[PDB]
Amino acid sequence: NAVAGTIREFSPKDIESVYRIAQTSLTEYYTQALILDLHREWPESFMVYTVAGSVVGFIVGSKYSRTEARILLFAVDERFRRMGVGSALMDAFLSLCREQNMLSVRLEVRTDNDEAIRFYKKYGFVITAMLPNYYSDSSNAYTMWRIVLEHHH
Ligand SMILES: CC(=O)SCCNC(=O)CCNC(=O)[C@H](O)C(C)(C)COP(=O)(O)OP(=O)(O)OC[C@H]1O[C@@H](n2cnc3c(N)ncnc32)[C@H](O)[C@@H]1OP(=O)(O)O
């Protein structure tokens, strides 16, 4: 309870913060209005990790299919990386999927991006395809995937 910094849900009021983290963490470009737009489609999934009322990371998703969710933007501020924030947000994203009966979740990541590729592999994600000339700068992308449902013995 005493942990400093909790997960809340994005507000149009946080845009400059998120727009700043995305500029400085993602090679693909995202205008503020586009991010504000990605909100509208699945707002409840746009969540931020807040630390002394400063957004230090955010995730945001769409419903690709009635039951498959997709992760559109995921980023955490350099100065807070490895804090374990993005694990908060993924934990939270998955919980929300569990809640709205989304049975699996996909995403697309750059191929070169080893740092994240692991992060997701830590969370159970796996590679299913490679998307040729996917990004605007003509590099490729791995599509990663996992079921939501978990069991331990
Ligand atoms: C779909 C899209 O939008 S693409 C997403 C954009 N990709 C990015 O790189 C955005 C900027 N970077 C990130 O957001 C990083 O992936 C982060 C910040 C989420 C990872 O760090 P944080 O969220 O602050 O801490 P987090 O709890 O996520 O650490 C993740 C865990 O995965 C593993 N991990 C994280 N980074 C790495 C790495 N570079 N190499 C190997 N393993 C790693 C670690 O085991 C770590 O847990 P532990 O080190 O505490 O055991």
Side-chain angles (χ1 to χ4, degrees):
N1 190 156
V3 54
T6 175
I7 281 189
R8 75 151 155 75
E9 199 190 293
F10 174 124
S11 169
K13 308 294 283 174
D14 306 21
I15 178 57
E16 187 184 342
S17 326
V18 181
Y19 171 65
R20 195 195 44 74
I21 299 198
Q23 183 64 54
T24 77
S25 308
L26 301 152
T27 307
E28 192 74 349
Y29 179 48
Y30 284 92
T31 76
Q32 294 203 15
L34 175 64
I35 290 159
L36 292 171
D37 201 6
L38 301 179
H39 189 224
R40 280 171 252 221
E41 239 198 333
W42 190 6
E44 322 112 4
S45 84
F46 203 116
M47 305 181 291
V48 285
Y49 198 102
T50 181
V51 166
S54 272
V55 170
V56 301
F58 71 96
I59 191 162
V60 58
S62 84
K63 291 187 180 196
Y64 179 73
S65 146
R66 274 189 171 223
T67 50
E68 186 164 41
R70 163 144 154 269
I71 307 199
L72 301 177
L73 274 195
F74 196 22
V76 208
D77 190 334
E78 204 139 23
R79 326 225 310 290
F80 299 59
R81 293 182 183 174
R82 237 156 206 316
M83 228 56 229
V85 201
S87 279
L89 296 170
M90 186 68 86
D91 278 358
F93 194 77
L94 291 161
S95 171
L96 179 76
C97 288
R98 283 194 272 275
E99 198 175 289
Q100 311 214 326
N101 299 94
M102 307 300 291
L103 301 154
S104 80
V105 179
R106 65 162 47 214
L107 53 91
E108 289 89 34
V109 67
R110 295 179 95 79
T111 321
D112 70 55
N113 185 327
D114 281 337
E115 285 82 340
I117 286 167
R118 271 156 181 154
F119 172 107
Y120 296 134
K121 210 177 277 78
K122 187 96 192 257
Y123 266 109
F125 286 66
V126 179
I127 305 198
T128 58
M130 175 177 72
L131 305 194
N133 289 291
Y134 174 94
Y135 291 92
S136 61
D137 75 343
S138 312
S139 55
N140 297 24
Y142 285 137
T143 272
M144 299 184 65
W145 185 82
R146 57 155 305 184
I147 295 300
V148 157
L149 171 38
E150 260 165 307
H151 296 311
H152 313 64
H153 305 332

